[PDB]
Curated annotation (Swiss-Prot):
Alphabetical UniProt keywords: Calcium, Disulfide bond, Hydrolase, Lipid degradation, Lipid metabolism, Metal-binding, Signal, Zymogen
Main EC class the enzyme belongs to: hydrolase
Residues at the catalytic site: 140 (nucleophile), 199 (charge relay system), 253 (charge relay system)
Catalytic activity: a triacylglycerol + H2O = a diacylglycerol + a fatty acid + H(+)
Name of the protein in its database record: Lipase
Disulfide bonds: 25-264, 36-39, 231-240
Record organism: Rhizomucor miehei
Binding positions (Ca(2+)): 252
Family classification: Belongs to the AB hydrolase superfamily. Lipase family.
Length: 265
């Protein structure tokens, strides 16, 4: 390219895713460880470281592984887531590195813160380781951161690259633118891314514114088994896732594969 993846790849991726887832947881972161559951796977690884931161917171870581090786880184893412896514825113720125580218710122710131430390650680580781690878991764935111871281690483460069580194892532867313892516691719690294498926874261932112893315892618678618686817490429595319758218777822996010892522668971 596308393818597927493988297985491985797936495984790886798952592982890564786881780681892323683981881271877241716391323990691981931171714691760281591983513980947881898953862781284981890773554981092983180681860781190282971681961271957381414060311101932104961122967381992461690283680881490583070884074985594987690787290283790783992671891242985571946131915591818471848902818321973151728811718230876231873116721113863118630128870145830185590169230139142109751118891325956114926140892432860157976261890463830155851691880175540194881481890277450183890584590187350281790587360185230680280197070888290883690284890876890265983461997832979300983681992835873105892771991517840135890776780138840174690569750149730184160291070493790382691509290869190793890787890345992965897962878812893532885217861151840136394209340118850145490319750158891343370139670097390459690888890456992967893843896413788961648906996810938513890846886618863121837216495419438319611118931113884218790258890486690759893966896616897953488925678971079972598972598946894845892847695419590859890297860057972114469419294819795957884216495718568916718118538708877417847230848951897826967281877781891846299955695982848871863021928571851891």
């Amino acid at each position: 390219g596308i393818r597927a993846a493988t297985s491985q790849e797936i495984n790886e991726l798952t592982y890564y895713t786881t780681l892323s887832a683981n881271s877241y947881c716391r323990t691981v972161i931171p714691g760281a460880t591983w513980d947881c559951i898953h862781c284981d796977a890773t554981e092983d690884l180681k860781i190282i470281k971681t961271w957381s931161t414060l311101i932104y917171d961122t967381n992461a870581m690283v680881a490583r592984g070884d074985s594987e090786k690787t290283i790783y880184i992671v891242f985571r893412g946131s915591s818471s887531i848902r818321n973151w896514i728811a718230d876231l825113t873116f721113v863118p720125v630128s870145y830185p590195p590169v230139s142109g580218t751118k891325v956114h710122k926140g892432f860157l710131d976261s890463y830155g813160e851691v880175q540194n430390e881481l890277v450183a650680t890584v590187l350281d580781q790587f360185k230680q380781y280197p070888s290883y690878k690284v890876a890265v991764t983461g997832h979300s935111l983681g992835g873105a951161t892771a991517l840135l871281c890776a780138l840174d690483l690569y750149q730184r460069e160291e070493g790382l690259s691509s290869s190793n580194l890787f890345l992965y892532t897962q878812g893532q867313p885217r861151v840136g633118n394209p340118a850145f892516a490319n750158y891343v691719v370139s670097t390459g690294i690888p890456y992967r891314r893843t896413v788961n498926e648906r996810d938513i874261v890846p886618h863121l932112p837216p495419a438319a514114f611118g931113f884218l893315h790258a890486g690759s892618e893966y896616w897953i678618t488925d678971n079972s088994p598972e598946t894845v686817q892847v695419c590859t490429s890297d860057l972114e595319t469419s294819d795957c896732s884216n495718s568916i758218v718118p538708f877417t777822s847230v848951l897826d996010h967281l877781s891846y594969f299955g695982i848871n892522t863021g928571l851891c668971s």
